[PDB]
Amino acid sequence: MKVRAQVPTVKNATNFNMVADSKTAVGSTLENLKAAIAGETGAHAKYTAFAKAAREQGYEQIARLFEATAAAELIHIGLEYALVAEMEPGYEKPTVAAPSAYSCDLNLISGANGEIYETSDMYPAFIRKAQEEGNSKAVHVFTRAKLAESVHAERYLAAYNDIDAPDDDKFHLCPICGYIHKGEDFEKCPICFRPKDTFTAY
Template sequence: MTDQSISATVKNLESAFAGESMANRKYLYFARRCRELGADDVAEVFEETARQETAHAFGHLELLYPPQTLSVEKMLQMAIEGEVYEYTEMYPAFRHTALEEQNQAAVEEMDEQIAESREHAETFFRVLEQAARRFQALAGVEQRHANRYRDALNRVENS
């Protein structure tokens, strides 16, 4: 699907999801820093707000990815695609910019993210392969059960 074929509402939901997700992570970071500074009461406010931001983000996701449309395999494939994009396109482009700006700390961060995104993609791929093997094994078991039931039904019908 090209960006031109995505509705304005879908684009808005994606932006809202990104904003809520970013707020969640930022507030959890702020909470951690508040705890380091001894402001546990403020940390609790940030943590509660982060939980609410997560609920908002999940609401947006349910509209973007209706639960009834998501199989385990589809979710794993989407995760693989996202991680591959991160380590092949997104982070390398960010790294290039950081290099041009001579921001070594950002270059190192991007290098870590490239490696971790590759690991994540490989992990999701292994899980997808394992799920496929389990499904194939289960299909064989189900076929044997179906054959037994069909044979039993035939015996009943023929007697």
């Protein structure tokens, strides 16, 4: 993902449309924030299981990608939780069980499909609802998550295509958003502009 003159938003980007045949239940923004947290909690558990399986299967770099992406989902949960907490202090983040991890290639495909669903269906649906309800804070949070998900999808597909050609590149995760970069060739986050030196290496 290229760095643009300004950070991408629904006001200056053209990949924020929701698939017409959406599989997402849309409620109030508060309900959507909770739904997103629930979904991301599941994603985190899935990627964590996928990472453990990848390591056992001999795919250390892919394991690191799953670990970096799980960490990215945790950042999303944090952003969403902060908003829910201000509106409903009694709200407690949910916990989920770990799902099964299968062959690494299929896990990468499962990951890619989930990321695509989140970036083109779920988050766009929630962003639209937040816009229609005037919840700018939610639009911001959902937008940041949405942008990282399509990057995650690309990273998973790249890893799938090069499943038998790994390298020593580290995956750098942004400190405040889910952006992940493979390798050292970048200066700042294309989603939030945080400098490279603030990223965490996986």
